[PDB]
Every structure is written in C-alpha cells, then in structure tokens.
Design a protein around this ligand. Structure first.
Ligand SMILES: *[C@H]1O[C@H](CO)[C@H](O)[C@H](O)[C@H]1O
Ligand SMILES: *[C@H]1O[C@H](CO)[C@H](O)[C@H](O)[C@H]1O
Ligand SMILES: *[C@H]1O[C@H](CO)[C@H](O)[C@H](O)[C@H]1O
Ligand SMILES: *[C@H]1O[C@H](CO)[C@H](O)[C@H](O)[C@H]1O
Ligand SMILES: *[C@H]1O[C@H](CO)[C@H](O)[C@H](O)[C@H]1O
Length: 48
C-alpha cells in the first residue's frame, strides 16, 4: 500500500501574555510664584 497519510496538524499555538501597564506620571509642577503688590503712593505729611 501507499504510505498512509500523516495525522492532522495541530491548531495554532496561543499568543504570549500581553505586556504590563505603564506607570503614573510624576506629580505636576506647582504654579508660578505670583509677584507681590506695589507699594502705596507716597503718603502726605503728618498733621502739625
Ligand atoms: C493521504 O496521502 C496518502 C499518500 O501518501 C494516501 O493517498 C492517503 O489515502 C491520503 O489520505
Ligand atoms: C501539518 O502537520 C501534520 C503533522 O502534524 C502534517 O505534517 C501535515 O502534512 C501538515 O500540513
Ligand atoms: C503551541 O500550541 C499548539 C497546539 O495548540 C502546538 O502544540 C504548538 O506546537 C505549540 O507551539
Ligand atoms: C503635570 O506634569 C505631570 C508630569 O510632569 C503630568 O504630565 C501631569 O498630567 C501634568 O498636569
Ligand atoms: C514677580 O516675582 C515673581 C517671583 O516671586 C515672578 O518672578 C514674577 O514674574 C514677577 O512679576
């Protein structure tokens, strides 16, 4: 007899485990230091 046909081929292997997740970004930098107010106008003279 002719050589018997080979057994069926196995189904495709499963995909490797999917990668882990990224890490949360470092704390966002604080706001800019707001500048101070301006000095009051030159005051008048004290009462006599
Ligand atoms: C698979 O091939 C063989 C020959 O190698 C044979 O013809 C079988 O009948 C067939 O199923
Ligand atoms: C798929 O694999 C089988 C053996 O498992 C055989 O070689 C077939 O010829 C091939 O198509
Ligand atoms: C991955 O699995 C299939 C069967 O699901 C087969 O065995 C391969 O040889 C293997 O790499
Ligand atoms: C402030 O910066 C961090 C990273 O430095 C992150 O992107 C925040 O989303 C942002 O608000
Ligand atoms: C006033 O000072 C702050 C820093 O405290 C900053 O440089 C502002 O740009 C400036 O106007």
């Amino acid at each position: 007899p002719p050589p018997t046909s080979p057994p069926p081929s196995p189904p495709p292997s499963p995909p490797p485990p999917r990668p882990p997740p990224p890490p949360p970004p470092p704390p966002s930098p604080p706001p800019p230091n707001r500048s101070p107010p301006p000095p009051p106008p030159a005051s008048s003279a004290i009462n006599p």
